[PDB]
Amino acid sequence: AAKDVKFGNDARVKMLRGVNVLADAVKVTLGPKGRNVVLDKSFGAPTITKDGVSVAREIELEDKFENMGAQMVKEVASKANDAAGDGTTTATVLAQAIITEGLKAVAAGMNPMDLKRGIDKAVTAAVEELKALSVPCSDSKAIAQVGTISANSDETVGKLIAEAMDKVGKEGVITVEDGTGLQDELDVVEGMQFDRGYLSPYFINKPETGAVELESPFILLADKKISNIREMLPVLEAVAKAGKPLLIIAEDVEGEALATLVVNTMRGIVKVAAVKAPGFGDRRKAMLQDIATLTGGTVISEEIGMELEKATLEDLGQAKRVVINKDTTTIIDGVGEEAAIQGRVAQIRQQIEEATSDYDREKLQERVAKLAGGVAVIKVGAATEVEMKEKKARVEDALHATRAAVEEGVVAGGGVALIRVASKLADLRGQNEDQNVGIKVALRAMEAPLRQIVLNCGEEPSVVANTVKGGDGNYGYNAATEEYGNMIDMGILDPTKVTRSALQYAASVAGLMITTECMVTDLP
Amino acid sequence: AAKDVKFGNDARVKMLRGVNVLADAVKVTLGPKGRNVVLDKSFGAPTITKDGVSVAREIELEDKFENMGAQMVKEVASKANDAAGDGTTTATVLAQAIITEGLKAVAAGMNPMDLKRGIDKAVTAAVEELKALSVPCSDSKAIAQVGTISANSDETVGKLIAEAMDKVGKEGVITVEDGTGLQDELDVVEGMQFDRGYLSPYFINKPETGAVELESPFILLADKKISNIREMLPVLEAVAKAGKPLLIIAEDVEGEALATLVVNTMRGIVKVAAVKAPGFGDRRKAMLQDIATLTGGTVISEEIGMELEKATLEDLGQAKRVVINKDTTTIIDGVGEEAAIQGRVAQIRQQIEEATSDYDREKLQERVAKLAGGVAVIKVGAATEVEMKEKKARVEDALHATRAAVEEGVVAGGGVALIRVASKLADLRGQNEDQNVGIKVALRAMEAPLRQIVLNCGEEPSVVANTVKGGDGNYGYNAATEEYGNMIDMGILDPTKVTRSALQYAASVAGLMITTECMVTDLP
Amino acid sequence: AAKDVKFGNDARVKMLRGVNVLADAVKVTLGPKGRNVVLDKSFGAPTITKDGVSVAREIELEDKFENMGAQMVKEVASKANDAAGDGTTTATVLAQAIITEGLKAVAAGMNPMDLKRGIDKAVTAAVEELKALSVPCSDSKAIAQVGTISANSDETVGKLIAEAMDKVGKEGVITVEDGTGLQDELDVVEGMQFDRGYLSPYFINKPETGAVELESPFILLADKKISNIREMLPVLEAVAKAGKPLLIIAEDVEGEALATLVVNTMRGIVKVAAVKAPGFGDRRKAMLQDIATLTGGTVISEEIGMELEKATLEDLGQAKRVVINKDTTTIIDGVGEEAAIQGRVAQIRQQIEEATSDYDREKLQERVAKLAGGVAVIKVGAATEVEMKEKKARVEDALHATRAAVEEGVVAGGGVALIRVASKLADLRGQNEDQNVGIKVALRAMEAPLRQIVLNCGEEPSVVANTVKGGDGNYGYNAATEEYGNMIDMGILDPTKVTRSALQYAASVAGLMITTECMVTDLP
């Protein structure tokens, strides 16, 4: 297809309008006191929302180019979110802030390669300043505290999160289920999690988490690439009969079999999902076994001559629940009996003895930790379903932000942290005075999130900012109650990871744009 | 269909905008410090890339003519890469530099046939200068060195490449597989390679190498033209049953049978690919046997009365892997037992005794070399799949550029080489003073790739060029570190083959356009 | 359909622009130093070509009328080619030259019928002058020499052509096959050739020669008109089983059966081709027999009551190769045993004894000559297929031009011949001074091909032409080397046939257009 190519100025001027529309729609929602964005929908009434992520998802512009410019910032900002659990809007707001001023700089006749270099030094410096201002959060007291602050002053949540990390380690796998009483429970159970995502965004049955959730499913454990669906049919119908869903863990599922399964859970004929088996090569075939052991299944390997056609219900593994992400599979409560599972831990235990190399040591301590370490489930209780299925999502929110605090501490939440570091590195210089412009661009972009929250509440932004700047450390303005104070004590704090990721990602994409010379896309 | 015909000037003016668009998009990527080109894509976010080959592939203009112009330079520039492993972008950037000044010349009222002749004498001369500046690369030390420089300062790669040529000769067939541990292996195995490509760009399952890769496949060895699919059916279904792919080596596969197999690996019914048997006539029927012996197969020849219908699984040959290119088939690890294979080497050994002619000698020493010489595989090891399936590609890159250094030596990588030879032949004259303009056009074009690199870095091009020019031999500017030095010691070198090819292919196409008088294409 | 009708002037003015487009595009390629024509193509890169026949094939204009104008010249010029083996472009360039000046004359107010008569007198005269200047080429020394000059300085080709004429007579049938070694062979074998072409341009499997080539095929010999396909089915499936192609020689194959076979070799179900049996009436039924005898087949004649349904494989004839043209069928190496073939020659031998009339004599000496005379095959050998399948085509080229020299000698090749004869007849007058205009039109047209070659080389045309004119005999300018000399000795010669055909056919079509008064075509 004939493309349409734009260059240099024109390409960036397009990209800029693009990002402006994405940011201008998504930024108005930033506060605790955001403005509403109305988002049309076909059958029935429009959706009124105060939520950036939701506005952003809907944005897509007519004029390609313009479009790409928004799609681009969208993609980076979403990634902040993927590595944290928040900041998508912040990411966006700041990415606008640099690109606007950066791009305008370049069009002004300044050197892009310098404009960027400056932006990057300012971010580098700010990320240091951030680690400095950051307050560790390591002990059960602080976990629970961040946990409660994040579920919005709910001690009972913080307690639970803190108790689960207490039980399965700060590393341990922790999930959340629907509670069955009024009471919250926290059980620990034989389970496991590994770094593989769904093989198509289509198996997703809960678009809320954008994830797949299966109940009482059988697990197919196959060591080989799966291309033909002919091989599946004997098993896939023994499974539609026991009326339960089924998870495919194989070396891969490609083109044919994959596009088949996808169209088959679309018409809801049989609920199915598939994921690549964990790791690669040699430690893959031993790792697949572990999953088998855990779930009381059998590994179908072509290497001992077994076919997928000669596989009854009985060969398959089984658990009480599984949950798969963009990039995570997690298996909860496997039927595998502790005779076998315990026994297999004793086998691997010993392999660490005869380990001659250090690399060979870790890879085994990682399999013991997955297998014997198990998974902590948190059933959430409440008095009514509307009330409970809500609380659940709020725990999942805090659980997320807590994990990220445990990793890199917490800081002033009002975009305060950002304003703070930016006022600290006001002397920062470069070589080129174009390179200084780049720093002063990035610096001045960091007041963007505060200035915008204030504005969204209809307060003077200039005025609030200047007073947050005149203080120190974690002193800041809480826009929800319009008071100043120590942001952390008033319970308005971001994990540090997220504030930093937001900054870094907004920085990258802005950089990318300042150094774009050409854009290529389809003919209108 | 009615065509639209353009003549002379107009034809050339169209061609020139066409090529300008392709080069202007593609050239901005040239350095190690390229600029970004954003390349839209439908579902999902655009692709940001610094990679010429990728930008080029996307270019296609609306205005046919304009299109042809671009499509023409793209074709030639692609070929440089087919005959080397790099230079696509360099080729394009130089093509643009000649064409621009050339076409402007002819439009100016000078003689195209002279303008060309000049361009060609300059290229001839420069190619000589190049072989002179070229530094041989012959011993294990230098192989490893170019191997490492090419995999980007990775001694462990260079080692391996150098060890494989050590084991199988600088001629020997070398492939790369996916490693299974952390460790890199280098095995030597009963295998072979010959000059035949796939019979349709459709069997390609890995568009990354743009090649076909089959695993544990059966090999059909048929000496006859295959037109009807009726003849295949008995075997093709015995094969879909053993659940493995299948390679067809026959005298040919034509129209019917071909278009059948093509549609059949498209719906992934049976993974299949076919290639013309190697050589022609008499030495064809003997060479097809060699493959059989190697893979423990049987040759189905109509000359002893065997049909393809009367062929069971057992007649077919077999290996552990095969890989087919645009123009190469390579068989790895054949089941053929060294009883038969060794025995067939003893037969051919003897045929060299009774060889009465020299032509009959080589043709046999070539079959021994293919058969007894075997194939060196390099399994690549690493710590994570993302890390390893990467390193693999990077080895494949060096392995390529190594082969081409072994052939014609190496030179200053920064487009330095080019600038050097051009400053050497600044006296070069012709007869027409039109022909002089032609040399000066081509000479000045040779500073294009260096000038452009420096510019992509935001340095003064004029200024760096002039300083590289005032030096000698392989002294040049390394735009990655902004230091001058000897380009080869700083590890920035191109194989000579590629620098030459790039020049020659740019020159060819530019020539062709300067002498185009008419363009014929479909009605808008 | 409603037509659009144009008259008189407008009709011709349309026709003229149409021919100018076809010529202007095709002429630029004329030299040994042509210019390039770029011919777009859909999937992939355009084609750059220096070859007129190629350019012409693609031409087709939007404006019907303008279209006809070009389609007409194309048709005539293509015929020059059919009756020679070259000159298509020449034919075209000359046709333009007359039409341009002729059409201009009539539009000027001169009598078309006189304008024509003149052009015709000038052509008559020039065709005489040409026979005179024609240098004979009759002995083995000259054959070989034209043979080598034509395969482009390759003595080994010339030798072979000259040897085959040596073995089968200057009349004898000669074909060219794919060699199997490095060595060229020249065998003589039981075969035959007759004046019948394919029954549809669709059986063509090698569009390069624009011909059909079948290997180891069965021959069906049927004396009757074949309309229904019902009659074929028993045989056509006995044949698709032995996996070989099949040739139909019948009295005719009409509508139904024909359109069936055509669609059946299109989907490559069974490779088939059909041709009218040779001659007519009585000598047809005897001649069909000869072919049978030659190929060891049986003649299915309705006159003894045999049906096509009652015909097994065994009735059919057979050979090792057959090759069918637009208008030629040639059978190579028939299975028919020399017992029967020799015996049949003794029968016909005798028929010449009892021949009471002269017409009855020749018709029989013609069947003996076809049958006992046999066919000379030339296997072409070389070192590589790319190298050999090429050389083959080059032999075919010389073989062609050689046969045509053997017929009317050779002449100065630079369009020198044309210039010479036209300088000779510069006094030539007619009766109308309109008729004179006509002669001067045609005379002046004959310098076109030289003036054009020179131009395609960027040399003064005027100047070159005037010096070639001042000479005598075959003295001319060789544009490839820019020297003057004796064109034949410098080995730049055309066969006389072609130069004459080119003139005659150009002249016809031009004549036609000057006397056109009306054009009728479909509504845009």
UniProtKB/Swiss-Prot annotation, chains A, B, C:
What HAMAP family has UniProt attached to this entry?
Answer: CH60
Q: What is its EC number?
A: 5.6.1.7
Q: What does this protein do?
A: Together with its co-chaperonin GroES, plays an essential role in assisting protein folding. The GroEL-GroES system forms a nano-cage that allows encapsulation of the non-native substrate proteins and provides a physical environment optimized to promote and accelerate protein folding, probably by preventing aggregation and by entropically destabilizing folding intermediates. Also plays a role in coupling between replication of the F plasmid and cell division of the cell.
- Record's SUPFAM superfamilies? GroEL apical domain-like, GroEL equatorial domain-like, GroEL-intermediate domain like
Task: Spell out the molecular function terms from Gene Ontology.
Answer: ATP binding; ATP hydrolysis activity; ATP-dependent protein folding chaperone; identical protein binding; isomerase activity; magnesium ion binding; unfolded protein binding
Q: Which residues carry this modification: N6-acetyllysine?
A: 116
Q: Which NCBIfam families match?
A: GroEL, PRK00013.1, PRK12849.1, PRK12850.1, PRK12851.1
Effect noted on mutating residue 108 to C? Forms inter-ring disulfide bonds. Prevents ring separation and leads to the formation of high amounts of symmetric GroEL:GroES2 complexes
Any Pfam family hit: Cpn60_TCP1
Ways its activity is controlled: During the substrate-folding cycle, the two GroEL rings separate for effective substrate binding and chaperonin activity. Ring separation is triggered by ATP binding to the trans ring of the asymmetric GroEL:GroES complex and avoids formation of functionally impaired symmetric GroEL:GroES2 complexes. Activity of the GroEL-GroES chaperonin complex requires Mg-ATP. UMPylation of the chaperone by SelO/YdiU negatively regulates its activity, and may facilitate survival under stress conditions.
- One CC-aspect GO term: membrane
Q: What is this protein called?
A: Chaperonin GroEL
Its EC top class is: isomerase
